[PDB]
Amino acid sequence: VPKWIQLNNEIMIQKDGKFQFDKDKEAVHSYFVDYINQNTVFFHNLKEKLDYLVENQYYEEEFLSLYSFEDIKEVFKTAYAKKFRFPSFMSAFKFYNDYALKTNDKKKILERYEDRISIVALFFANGDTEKAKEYVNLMINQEYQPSTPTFLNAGRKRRGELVSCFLLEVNDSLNDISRAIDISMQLSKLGGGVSLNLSKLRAKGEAIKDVENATKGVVGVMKLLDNAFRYADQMGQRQGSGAAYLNIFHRDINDFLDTKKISADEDVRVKTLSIGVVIPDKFVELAREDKAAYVFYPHTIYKEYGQHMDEMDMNEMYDKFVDNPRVKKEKINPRKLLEKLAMLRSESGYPYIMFQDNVNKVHANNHISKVKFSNLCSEVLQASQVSSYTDYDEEDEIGLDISCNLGSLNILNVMEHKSIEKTVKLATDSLTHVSETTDIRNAPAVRRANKAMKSIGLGAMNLHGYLAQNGIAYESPEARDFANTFFMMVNFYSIQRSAEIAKEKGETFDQYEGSTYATGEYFDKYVSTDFSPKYEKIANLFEGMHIPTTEDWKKLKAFVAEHGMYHSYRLCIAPTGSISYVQSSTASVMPIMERIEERTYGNSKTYYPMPGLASNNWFFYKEAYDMDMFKVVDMIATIQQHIDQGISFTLFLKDTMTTRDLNRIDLYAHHRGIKTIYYARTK
Amino acid sequence: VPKWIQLNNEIMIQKDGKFQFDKDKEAVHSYFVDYINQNTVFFHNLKEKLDYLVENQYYEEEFLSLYSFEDIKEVFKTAYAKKFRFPSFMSAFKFYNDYALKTNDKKKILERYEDRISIVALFFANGDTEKAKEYVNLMINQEYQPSTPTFLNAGRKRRGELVSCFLLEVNDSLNDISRAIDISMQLSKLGGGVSLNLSKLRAKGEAIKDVENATKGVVGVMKLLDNAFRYADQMGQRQGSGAAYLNIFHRDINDFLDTKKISADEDVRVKTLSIGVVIPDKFVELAREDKAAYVFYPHTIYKEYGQHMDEMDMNEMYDKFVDNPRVKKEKINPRKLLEKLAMLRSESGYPYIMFQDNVNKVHANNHISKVKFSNLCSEVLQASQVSSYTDYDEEDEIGLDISCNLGSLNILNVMEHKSIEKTVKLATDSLTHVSETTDIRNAPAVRRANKAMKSIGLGAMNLHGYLAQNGIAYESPEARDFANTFFMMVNFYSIQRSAEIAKEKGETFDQYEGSTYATGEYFDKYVSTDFSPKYEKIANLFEGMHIPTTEDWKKLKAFVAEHGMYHSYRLCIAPTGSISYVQSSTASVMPIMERIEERTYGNSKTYYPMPGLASNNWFFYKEAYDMDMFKVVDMIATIQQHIDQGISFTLFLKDTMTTRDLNRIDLYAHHRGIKTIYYARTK
Amino acid sequence: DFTQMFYNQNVKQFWLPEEIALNGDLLTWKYLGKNEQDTYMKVLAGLTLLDTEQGNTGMPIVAEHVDGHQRKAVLNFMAMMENAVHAKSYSNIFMTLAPTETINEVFEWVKQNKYLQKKAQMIVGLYKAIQKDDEISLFKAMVASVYLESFLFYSGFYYPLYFYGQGKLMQSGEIINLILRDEAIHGVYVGLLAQEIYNKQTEEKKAELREFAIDLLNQLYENELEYTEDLYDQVGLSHDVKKFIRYNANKALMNLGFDPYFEEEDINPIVLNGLKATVEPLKDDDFYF
Amino acid sequence: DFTQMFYNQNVKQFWLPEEIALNGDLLTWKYLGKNEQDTYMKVLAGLTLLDTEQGNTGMPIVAEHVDGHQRKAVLNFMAMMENAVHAKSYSNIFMTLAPTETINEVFEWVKQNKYLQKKAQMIVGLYKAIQKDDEISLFKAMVASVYLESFLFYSGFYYPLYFYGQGKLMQSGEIINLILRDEAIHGVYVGLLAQEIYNKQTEEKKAELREFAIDLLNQLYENELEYTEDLYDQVGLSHDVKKFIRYNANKALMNLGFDPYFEEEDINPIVLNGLKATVEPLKDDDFYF
Ligand SMILES: Nc1ncnc2c1ncn2[C@@H]1O[C@H](COP(=O)(O)OP(=O)(O)OP(=O)(O)O)[C@@H](O)[C@H]1O
Ligand SMILES: Nc1ncnc2c1ncn2[C@@H]1O[C@H](COP(=O)(O)OP(=O)(O)OP(=O)(O)O)[C@@H](O)[C@H]1O
Ligand SMILES: Cc1cn([C@H]2C[C@H](O)[C@@H](COP(=O)(O)OP(=O)(O)OP(=O)(O)O)O2)c(=O)[nH]c1=O
Ligand SMILES: [Mg+2]
Ligand SMILES: [Mg+2]
Ligand SMILES: [Mn+2]
Ligand SMILES: [Mn+2]
Ligand SMILES: [Mn+2]
Ligand SMILES: [Mn+2]
């Protein structure tokens, strides 16, 4: 066993009844003085390194050609001047195993952390040396972390796409289904997770040109997509991951759910395609009143009204659907469907739950389209227009397929540096650059939506780490007050940066004029309610930083009205799974699953303590499963009120609790304004 | 139990030690006195019937509008003047259960046999009343039978395409694979059987964008195609049928074959995807000499030579591939592979066997392309060019995808009417009309090849029926003499009609000038070898009909040289599954499987004796399983020497014979010039 | 001269209770009086106990002491039938016809029933007294086994057969007939093995073995009479069943090569009415024609 | 928690030798070299001899000491398969491929063979050491049984599977595959019975039983390596057979609820080719907060 492995395992060997957390630090030293420094490839100077990486097809030469070598040297020197040290063994291990650039045979390390950060910063700046240094300082301080696709692939010749998630709308036609399968394979080839809205597809037993009971429903398309994602599995490196979203009022909703039952037959079971359910407020109202609900056949509704079932408001059209004899429907028990959802989530963690009305009551771009589904991580909530892929030799009507670039603020590092504004603006600029340089030649709706919406996702990580390292319980009202203030600041500065980009470029996102940003409605709660901290401890935490007031929000509203906004969507809180290790941060705004996690790598086992875990903050690092899910819902709703897109909200459940407890948590989330629920992980 | 079913089951009841075959005739009468006439919709006049069928979206207005009502009435009167009577119960049952037009509620019969024949004739003639009457006389004499798609769908508004055999070339790309899946779905939606060539696809463990061990091979593509064919199942009417062809020198050939093993796992086995193997002469030579063979990685060959492995002659390329270090290959035992093929055919009848050099040594259009694969029934053998389907908003390079037009001569009815020439020419004209009226807007290469090649397949059936009713054993040399003469006359008149159509329209098929028809090579064996019958009995059978001599063939060769040939391909012998029942004929040129076949429809049993079966010809109606497969191979080769495309050749084996016997039959078929082997049906 | 034909007969008779659907008996069962249902449950429970011990103990122990792999294979197969097929079939019948509480009660009833405990004590005692390489102790256990197979089961078999013969409980009856068909061949086979051992003895020893067999039969018989009265008096059939068990006692004696002991009697006629392809390699001559 | 499920799986896997016609194997047998025929014969005799011990002693002795009627029935069924089905199947394969004199000589050789005897007697020794009412000695015998079913057979199974995966000796290979499928479930079942005993022990006693199991595995494994070279060097397969032994040793350990001992290895592809939360209804007022 390696020396650093033994040093890391020495953490759990208690001394005087206490964990040896400091041993972890020793491990990193070993991991660098025995493995990383020996396995790294050193050159005489930076010129030889850059030339070797360029000619050997490791780096794209275009982004490096925008800078003179003196500027690149200055950027690299700025990166190395911080003398960044990984405080935990797992941070360095995760970076050098998942994100550091290696040779073709993967026998040596070509990229250090500073090298990777410098390359990403130079790609972000697009020829601006000062901007590149700003990005270097932002990432080496670990205030901002680009998503895994962006951080791993920026400036690389053998790179994939920098966009993490893609959302596709599938129209009710064989041509559209085949095009959706093709685009899903193309985007999984690019490495991104693909989500498909199957609510427009007509249910099982519908007519294909006057011959009835002919359609296979959404389950056949689900099987096709599952095989497509199995085939396109990132060249066999990462399993192809897809998501299917169906409205709960679709007739196939049961069969949909039956794809995830552990007793499902092979002709129905789907195993590589995640499932999500979109629940309008009408379904929750029907379940609450115990009135029997009706699921609908989409094609009959489309024939009668000319629009898809998910294209209009069910809260106002459900009674018209039920009373219409030309609309076909089936009777269901909404409470039984809710119990089935809870049982499925207990068994397998599926489906994702999207509260459609919670998303669309604060959605700023309802004029473009209502949000009808979410992404594979159930945090992207954007307007999408379905595409009409016609026959060959016929022009296709290209719609809008959602796609946003992810980037997370490290809350602990951002607040320690007292740089919410600067970090938010620089992250917005980096995400705007990632969107601008993204061009996908096989997904036309994705390309058009990227060019028009200009949507980005700016997330946050290390919420629980910051709260526990500052002596604040994650479930406490003080923690929710901190989240309210911090994310109001993040939203304020993201809107300010979006408006500044719109002013400097003279262009807004497409159809911005009909948005609530243009009409000023979006700023209502910000121009009437003060989001400054209500607790003295939180206010002290925010000292040295100008917390925006109602007057600052009014000025920002006027600025947006004058100049517009460059981005249709700005903030989305992704799960941030593996890149949180490198940043020494807790995953996303979720509470920690465990204080010390035991992970098996190779034939060895390693223990990763939570960042900053110690004796004095052991009980502030409360495990998520031990927490009240209602207070976690309260925290997520408090954050969500300042996030325009959704938050990947994983439910952390105990084995003792029943499906009724899961249903109660889901209904409280819906009541509190939670937009989406990601996972039901049971301990 | 209905009266006609009792009268049909009375056949097996033996009187005086003989089957009551004549009772079947009585059954037909009952089937018409009790059921057909009662459930047949009658109109006051044909005008009312045509108006009702057109208005209720049963027929098409376009083809009926080309004639005055007097001409349509005259065509219907010509059809009804024959007073055609089905000689067996199963003929009428199959027609009125499969082909007769029924109401939307499927309880009444709108079309009789004469009505359907008249409608198909009017569709064929395209406005010529005399030509329509000629077609009516052809089909009511049952000399020619349009295929199930053409016969069932001609003149019907609610219909699939008139072509059901489609051959697709799949290029080695994700875009091409997705396009192939889409086209397969679209053609299965039209009701056609789709065959895909997977030899150009790179094997498992190949590089994608210079990353190693990334390709899933052809088995993942087969899984995708199997899912696509399961999804597209004719609006839930018939099981989606598809075929995949792989060259035996493709490295995936074992895994390909492993998709049909019973022991194969769920992630390996494809259930609704037929498989065929293309066997070049090089593989047979390697197996014969017991030299170990090599299966090659197609992408390495493409990188080294710039052409696909299946696009070049393996006979001259195999040694260069083996000696090339940059071509990756795996060692195999060709005799072990042959034994595996025989074992798989014994277990499941798969794969289909295509002898590439047997096809291509007589292929007339090798300049366009060599025949690389066959159809789902393993009888279509045509030149195909792969298409380069690029990314979106980029122009695709459309190639040639095979789609031939099926139609079968009834050898008994044709020869008893002494009308080989007239029937062949009229069938060629009808096939040309159906090929010209076919327009598929979702298969670009299929449409392009249909427009360019103008390839049709004119088959024959009732060969064994005709031979048995004339006191000739199917395995006798006299039967092969008759087949030689009859199919040489069929080829002569098909070529003459093709040249006449080319002269009339002033156009040949695309790239005809490079064909062996243009150079006169095709006629070589016809201008030197006399194909007149060598037996007096066969000559007396051909009495009253002019048998083309060598001088006639020289005149035809000169005529083709002067005027060209309209069809790239003219003759292919399809299995003729259900139309053989309606025509009261034995299926294809195959020998009969059973003298009397027992079938179960609903909860009732039915008995179909072979047409013309009696005590006198009971011995001549020898069952296929009791026959020597070498003599069946000899007869099929005798026919194949006059057929430009292949013949659906099913092997009929006993359970006693082993895989050595199957391999011997396959090798004798290869030796005798058999182009394709369809199935290995074990009794 | 016989094991191979018994092997073939035993394996060709293989069956599972699940082959017989039992829901068809639901109505004729519902229609029986409480007395009739009680006797029926108890009768089958007594049979279950006998097969439990024949499968767990009797057949395996005899298999252990009998020489020859083929003889052992037959005895092992018979043992499997006893506990994996026969004993289990009764639970299939119980689970179809009776509620769980009635099932629980009848199994409690077997534990406390003095005649059923006595007969188990006697039979199992003899099985467990077998001494390695001691043919006399083995003979005694084989006599006990024949008496279980060909005599003791029959106080139980009477009632399902009695119903089957009247067209009642015919699915359960079909199971019982299959069990009976098996026991008949089991009794013959074990009888032949017992005769082998008996035939090795002196005339004096034979005389003692006949005494053992007859004394044991009488002791079991007297107990079976009391058991029969206890079960059948409430359904009015005790005298009829007694005639049946005497009939079968004679068959058991005959299976042992002994003369019948009880006089012949008329049995209820109702009960009488109740009775890949082959692969060759390719030669170089198969490539030339 | 498991006996009825295993009962079902066992009885539904029932088969008989007569179902597979063996004569067509002579069409590939005649084409094997002397070393191939010799190895096959020796392997076959090895399997036959070990399986006889399991039928005559291993399964019946475990059935005798295990408590529970349903477990005894399943164990009886498994013993039946060894003696009535497997033993006849091995005999049938032999009689098809070799003349009587050759069979007698191969069995004489394998009976004297040092490596076959070492493992056969080690296993039999543990079966003979079981003491009445001593669950520790029963556990040790169960470990031995699992090692035979799930590990020791596989140095032998390798060769028929190797031919079967190549299209050679397909009829006997089909038979061997059915036998192997039975031994797999036997090993899993006996493994669960051993874990039941293991879980009733103290922590010190558990550690002691683990040491016993690993020590026994080591002794058997080192002898398997020698057995393997002795049989397979002449046909050049020993390296790959050794990988197959370790892979199956790991399965045997997992059957006993223990961690794998050997690192994961890939197996010869030819041989491979041969081979709820509590539902609680919503009570209303759960929709209001
Ligand atoms: N935790 C760590 N994170 C990142 N790099 C590290 C870490 N520990 C060691 N290294 C690398 O290994 C080298 C070993 O040097 P070390 O940290 O022991 O101190 P040093 O030799 O006094 O110099 P310096 O600390 O100034 O780099 C470091 O210079 C650095 O490049
Ligand atoms: N074998 C048959 N094949 C086809 N149609 C038949 C057959 N038998 C009877 N029919 C139908 O039933 C009708 C009655 O025929 P039938 O044998 O009674 O005498 P017919 O002289 O042909 O009668 P019609 O006056 O109808 O022409 C036929 O006209 C035809 O429509
Ligand atoms: C062709 C086909 C369609 N479908 C379903 C899936 C599609 O969502 C739906 C629409 O198919 P379409 O491609 O729209 O078929 P169509 O346009 O010819 O019929 P229509 O005019 O009624 O639109 O039909 C199947 O389930 N199986 C099939 O094989
Ligand atoms: Mg449509
Ligand atoms: Mg390519
Ligand atoms: Mn019994
Ligand atoms: Mn018995
Ligand atoms: Mn065995
Ligand atoms: Mn076993």
Coordinates of C-alpha atoms in Angstrom, one line a residue, chain B residues 309-484:
Chain B
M309 CA -13.3 -3.6 -46.6
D310 CA -16.5 -4.7 -48.3
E311 CA -15.9 -2.3 -51.2
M312 CA -12.9 -4.1 -52.6
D313 CA -12.4 -7.6 -53.9
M314 CA -11.3 -9.8 -51.0
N315 CA -9.8 -12.4 -53.4
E316 CA -7.1 -10.0 -54.4
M317 CA -7.0 -7.9 -51.2
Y318 CA -6.8 -10.6 -48.5
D319 CA -3.1 -11.3 -48.8
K320 CA -2.4 -7.6 -48.8
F321 CA -4.5 -7.1 -45.8
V322 CA -2.8 -9.9 -44.0
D323 CA 0.7 -8.7 -44.9
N324 CA -0.1 -5.1 -44.0
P325 CA 1.0 -4.3 -40.4
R326 CA -1.2 -1.2 -40.3
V327 CA -4.3 -3.5 -40.9
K328 CA -5.5 -5.0 -37.6
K329 CA -6.8 -8.6 -37.8
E330 CA -7.7 -11.6 -35.7
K331 CA -6.9 -15.2 -36.4
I332 CA -9.9 -17.5 -36.9
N333 CA -10.4 -21.0 -38.2
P334 CA -12.6 -20.8 -41.3
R335 CA -13.8 -24.5 -40.9
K336 CA -14.8 -23.7 -37.3
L337 CA -16.7 -20.7 -38.6
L338 CA -18.4 -22.8 -41.2
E339 CA -19.4 -25.4 -38.6
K340 CA -20.7 -22.5 -36.4
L341 CA -22.8 -21.3 -39.3
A342 CA -24.2 -24.7 -39.9
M343 CA -25.0 -25.2 -36.2
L344 CA -26.7 -21.8 -36.0
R345 CA -28.8 -22.6 -39.1
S346 CA -29.7 -25.9 -37.5
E347 CA -30.8 -24.2 -34.3
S348 CA -32.6 -21.2 -35.7
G349 CA -32.3 -21.1 -39.5
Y350 CA -29.9 -18.2 -39.3
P351 CA -27.8 -16.6 -40.8
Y352 CA -28.7 -16.2 -44.5
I353 CA -25.7 -17.1 -46.7
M354 CA -24.6 -14.9 -49.5
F355 CA -21.9 -16.2 -51.8
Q356 CA -20.5 -12.9 -52.9
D357 CA -18.4 -14.2 -55.9
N358 CA -21.3 -16.4 -57.1
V359 CA -23.4 -13.2 -57.2
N360 CA -20.8 -10.9 -58.7
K361 CA -19.4 -13.2 -61.4
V362 CA -22.7 -12.9 -63.2
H363 CA -23.6 -9.4 -61.9
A364 CA -24.3 -7.1 -64.8
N365 CA -23.7 -3.9 -62.9
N366 CA -20.4 -4.4 -61.2
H367 CA -19.2 -1.1 -62.6
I368 CA -21.9 0.7 -60.5
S369 CA -21.0 -1.5 -57.5
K370 CA -20.6 -5.1 -56.5
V371 CA -23.5 -6.8 -54.7
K372 CA -22.4 -6.6 -51.0
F373 CA -25.5 -7.9 -49.3
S374 CA -29.1 -9.2 -49.9
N375 CA -32.6 -8.4 -48.6
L376 CA -34.6 -9.8 -45.7
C377 CA -35.7 -12.7 -48.0
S378 CA -32.2 -13.2 -49.5
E379 CA -33.2 -12.9 -53.1
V380 CA -32.6 -9.2 -54.0
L381 CA -29.0 -8.9 -55.3
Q382 CA -28.2 -5.5 -56.7
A383 CA -25.5 -2.9 -56.8
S384 CA -25.6 -0.4 -53.9
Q385 CA -23.6 2.7 -53.1
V386 CA -23.2 3.9 -49.5
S387 CA -24.5 7.3 -48.6
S388 CA -22.5 9.9 -46.6
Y389 CA -25.0 11.4 -44.2
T390 CA -23.2 14.4 -42.7
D391 CA -24.1 16.6 -39.8
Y392 CA -27.0 19.0 -39.7
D393 CA -27.1 22.0 -42.1
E394 CA -24.6 20.1 -44.3
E395 CA -25.3 18.5 -47.6
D396 CA -25.5 14.7 -47.5
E397 CA -23.9 12.6 -50.3
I398 CA -26.9 10.4 -51.3
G399 CA -25.9 7.0 -52.6
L400 CA -28.0 4.1 -53.9
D401 CA -30.1 2.0 -51.6
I402 CA -31.8 -1.1 -53.2
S403 CA -35.6 -1.3 -53.4
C404 CA -36.9 -3.7 -56.1
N405 CA -40.4 -4.3 -57.2
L406 CA -41.9 -7.8 -56.6
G407 CA -44.2 -9.8 -58.8
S408 CA -44.5 -13.5 -59.5
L409 CA -45.4 -15.6 -62.6
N410 CA -47.6 -18.6 -62.0
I411 CA -45.7 -21.2 -64.0
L412 CA -48.6 -23.6 -64.2
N413 CA -51.1 -21.0 -65.4
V414 CA -48.5 -19.2 -67.6
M415 CA -47.5 -22.4 -69.4
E416 CA -51.0 -23.9 -69.8
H417 CA -52.0 -20.7 -71.5
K418 CA -48.8 -20.8 -73.7
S419 CA -48.3 -17.1 -72.8
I420 CA -44.7 -16.8 -71.4
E421 CA -43.9 -13.8 -73.6
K422 CA -47.2 -11.9 -73.0
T423 CA -47.3 -12.6 -69.3
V424 CA -43.6 -11.6 -68.8
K425 CA -44.0 -8.4 -70.8
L426 CA -47.2 -7.4 -69.0
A427 CA -45.7 -8.2 -65.6
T428 CA -42.6 -6.1 -66.5
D429 CA -44.8 -3.2 -67.5
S430 CA -46.8 -3.4 -64.3
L431 CA -43.6 -3.6 -62.2
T432 CA -42.2 -0.6 -64.1
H433 CA -45.4 1.3 -63.4
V434 CA -45.3 0.5 -59.7
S435 CA -41.6 1.4 -59.5
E436 CA -42.3 4.7 -61.2
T437 CA -45.2 5.5 -58.9
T438 CA -43.2 4.8 -55.8
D439 CA -42.0 8.0 -54.1
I440 CA -40.5 7.6 -50.6
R441 CA -39.8 11.0 -49.0
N442 CA -37.9 9.7 -45.9
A443 CA -35.4 7.3 -47.6
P444 CA -33.3 9.5 -49.9
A445 CA -31.0 6.8 -51.2
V446 CA -33.9 4.4 -51.7
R447 CA -35.8 7.0 -53.8
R448 CA -32.6 7.9 -55.8
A449 CA -31.9 4.3 -56.6
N450 CA -35.5 3.7 -57.5
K451 CA -35.4 6.7 -59.9
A452 CA -32.0 5.7 -61.4
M453 CA -31.8 1.9 -61.4
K454 CA -35.5 1.3 -62.2
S455 CA -34.9 -2.2 -60.8
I456 CA -37.8 -4.7 -60.6
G457 CA -38.1 -8.2 -59.5
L458 CA -40.1 -10.6 -61.6
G459 CA -40.4 -13.9 -59.8
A460 CA -42.0 -17.3 -60.5
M461 CA -44.1 -19.7 -58.4
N462 CA -46.0 -23.0 -58.8
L463 CA -42.9 -24.7 -60.2
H464 CA -43.3 -27.8 -58.1
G465 CA -47.1 -27.7 -58.6
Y466 CA -46.7 -27.5 -62.4
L467 CA -44.1 -30.3 -62.4
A468 CA -46.2 -32.6 -60.1
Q469 CA -49.4 -32.0 -62.1
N470 CA -47.4 -32.9 -65.3
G471 CA -45.9 -36.1 -63.9
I472 CA -42.4 -34.7 -63.3
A473 CA -40.4 -35.2 -60.2
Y474 CA -38.9 -32.0 -58.8
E475 CA -35.5 -33.7 -58.5
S476 CA -35.6 -35.3 -62.0
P477 CA -33.3 -34.1 -64.8
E478 CA -36.5 -33.4 -66.8
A479 CA -37.6 -30.9 -64.1
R480 CA -34.3 -29.1 -64.4
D481 CA -34.5 -29.1 -68.2
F482 CA -38.0 -27.5 -67.9
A483 CA -36.7 -24.9 -65.4
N484 CA -33.8 -24.1 -67.7

